[PDB]
Structure formats: structure tokens, C-alpha cells
Ligand SMILES: O=C(O)[C@@]1(O)C[C@H](O)[C@@H](O)[C@H]([C@H](O)[C@H](O)CO)O1
Ligand SMILES: O=C(O)[C@@]1(O)C[C@H](O)[C@@H](O)[C@H]([C@H](O)[C@H](O)CO)O1
């Protein structure tokens with residue numbers, strides 16, 4: 346790998362700052378957030394970077410009043426290299442007291458498509474949860490009013506403005522589902538043109554061309570609730586999903602035309618039942634797939650970025666622990682992540698972090714770290 350020859354490079358700093366932090370991120374209206382979770386990042390075709398998160402208004406929990414917030418880099422060519430290269434916090438959508446979340450963007454020339462999950466403010470995944478006003482939630486069910494919805498918003502101005510989200514639940518979620526999720530993290534555009542957005546038990550597929558996309562569903566038996574997808578070097582598709590119970594990632598491979606294998610545990614990739622991220626880095630020699638998750642069967646604090654050179658992404662190297670370049674003052678890093686390739690040939694990653702001030706409870710402040718590093722940084726790590 347010739348990339349090893351470059352001087353190793355890494356920067357890291359908090360980008361979404363929880364309410365407890367000095368420069369706590371708030372909207373221009375003065376609306377702030379206890380916590381930020383569930384990152385998604387894409388570089389646009391202009392080279393601008395767009396970073397999305399769930400703005401969790403009142404506590405760190407998955408339900409209640411949650412707005413879909415974002416930042417862009419100030420210019421198309423700064424690559425988010427320093428804190429001062431990022432705009433202040435903006436909102437994609439925050440209407441009502443329910444949950445707007447699961448950011449899953451994909452870039453198509455230009456247009457940015459952002460798929461989202463939504464639920465009503467009176468419902469939660471388990472039910473029986475107490476909201477700040479004392480209201481008790483109902484469990485997410487199969488009804489229209491009580492199910493998880495799937496929404497699509499678009500930007501045709503490099504993220505500056507977003508269309509009113511369109512509810513595509515009846516079109517792109519199976520009838521009779523209760524819980525649902527899209528991503529979270531990112532979709533992909535294939536070498537052959539199609540858009541592929543990972544979701545619970547399915548891919549959401551955009552055929553046609555840029556400016557004239559048509560969406561449909563590819564069902565995937567045994568896929569996770571929270572999936573990732575990648576075009577591997579052999580031109581095939583690769584789903585690398587969160588398992589239903591802690592242990593290992595689950596993986597399937599296929600195509601849009603012939604469908605997917607069943608899902609099987611990948612014994613090379615331990616996972617604690619948490620979201621991960623995957624990225625197609627490059628197509629020429631040597632081709633590389635990048636993977637990032639907590640490399641642990643029981644902890645989310647063992648973030649490890651890795652590289653596979655295999656045509657089918659079978660096997661990864663050990664890679665490097667993100668703790669080798671730690672951040673201070675933004676909690677204990679580890680959890681959900683998202684990766685993009687910046688216009689200056691770095692990996693750009695968003696990674697969750699947890700102050701743990703309320704332990705596992707609802708009052709623990711959550712922030713999101715932004716990281717850039719070159720392939721040399723990964724490849725020159727101690728156990729690679
Ligand atoms: O941090 C988690 O693990 C979390 O709770 C955060 C997400 O907001 C939630 O939608 C997701 C979901 O509960 C699981 O995928 C099981 O369906 O996981
Ligand atoms: O989180 C909310 O609900 C909030 O308070 C803050 C949001 O940033 C804003 O978008 C939203 C909206 O104005 C109303 O919910 C009516 O749609 O008001």
C-alpha cells in the first residue's frame with residue numbers, strides 16, 4: 346500500500362456540543378439541545394461537507410421531541426479541517442413534538458437525498474417511558490398514528506436549504522410493520538448509477554438517472570434494523586449490519602438484479618450491538634473498503650477503523666484504535682459513527698461520545714466528535 350509512505354495525519358475535535366459544554370450548539374432561534382446523537386456525514390460533489398445529527402432536546406433518549414439538525418463546512422474547499430471551517434448549527438426539520446431522526450444521506454450529482462425515520466411524540470419503541478411533562482408513552486405499533494414512518498427531504502443547493510419532508514411510508518415500508526429504521530449513516534451511488542440506501546430488512550433503491558429518480562424496495566430476509574451498504578471492488582454489494590444481540594456484525598453480499606445471500610456472523614468483526622459505518626474509499630490499485638465500529642463484543646468504547654483489500658471485503662486488517670488519538674473534554678468517545686472521503690483524500694468520521702454524568706440514564710450528555718485522518722494514520726498504527 347503506497348499510502349503508508351505519507352506522513353501520518355490526524356485531527357479531532359468536538360463538532361456537536363451538548364448543553365453542558367462551553368460552546369453548546371443551539372439554533373439561531375435560541376433553541377438548544379441536551380444531546381446530539383446518531384451522526385451522518387457526506388462530502389458533496391462541490392467538496393462541501395454536510396454533517397447531520399439528531400438534536401435531542403430534553404435528554405439523551407431515543408424518543409420524545411427530537412429535531413434533525415446539521416452543519417456544513419463554510420466553503421467547498423476547506424475540508425472541515427478546523428473548528429472555524431464549520432458553520433453554526435442549522436435545522437433540516439423539527440416540526441412537532443415527535444422524533445425526527447435516523448439521518449441517512451446519499452449524494453447524487455447536484456441533489457442530496459436525506460432519508461429519515463419519524464415517530465409520533467406520544468410513542469416509544471418499548472412503550473411505558475415517561476416524558477418530561479409526565480406523559481407515559483405508548484409502544485410503537487402497526488397503526489398509521491403509531492408506527493415508525495419513513496420520510497425524504499432533498500437539497501439542490503449544497504445543503505443550504507431542504508424541502509419539506511415527504512412521507513414515503515406507504516411506498517417504501519412494508520404494510521403492517523411497527524418499528525422501522527433507515528440507516529443511520531449513509532447511502533451510496535453505484536458505479537453503474539443506482540442509488541442504494543440501507544434500511545431495516547431492505548434496501549431502498551433509486552433507479553433512473555440524476556434529476557429523474559424512482560424509488561423501490563429490495564427486501565432482505567435476515568438483515569438488521571440498522572444496516573450499512575458498500576459496493577465492493579468486485580462490483581458486488583455488501584451489507585454489514587448491526588446484530589440483534591451483541592457479538593459480531595452480520596454480513597450479506599449480492600446484487601440489485603439477483604438479490605442477496607442470507608446474513609451470517611462475521612467472526613473477524615466483533616460488535617456490541619451498535620451501529621457501524623462502511624466506506625468505499627477507492628477503485629484503483631489497491632482497492633480499499635473502510636470499516637468503523639466498536640471492536641468489542643460488550644463495549645461501545647473500542648472504536649476501531651479498518652481497511653480491507655479483498656474483492657468481497659471478506660477480511661480486514663486490525664486497523665487502528667481511535668483512542669490512539671483521543672479527544673479531551675467532550676466525554677468518553679464511542680458509539681455510532683459515519684464516514685466520508687473528503688476532497689483532500691482523508692477519511693472524515695463523526696463519532697458519538699458520552700459524558701456518562703448520569704451513567705446509563707437519560708441525563709448523560711452526548712456529543713459528536715469530528716475526525717480527519719489519512720490512510721497512513723491507519724496503516725502506521727501499532728498493531729497493524
Ligand atoms: O443506541 C442505541 O442502541 C439505539 O437505542 C439508538 C437509536 O435511536 C435506536 O433507534 C436504536 C434501536 O433501538 C435499535 O436498533 C433496536 O431496534 O438503537
Ligand atoms: O422542537 C420543536 O418542536 C421547536 O420548539 C424547535 C424547532 O427547532 C422548531 O422547528 C419547532 C417548530 O417550530 C414547531 O414544533 C412547530 O412545527 O419548534
Ligand SMILES: [Ca+2]
Pocket residue numbers: 410411412439440441442443
Ligand atoms: Ca420538534
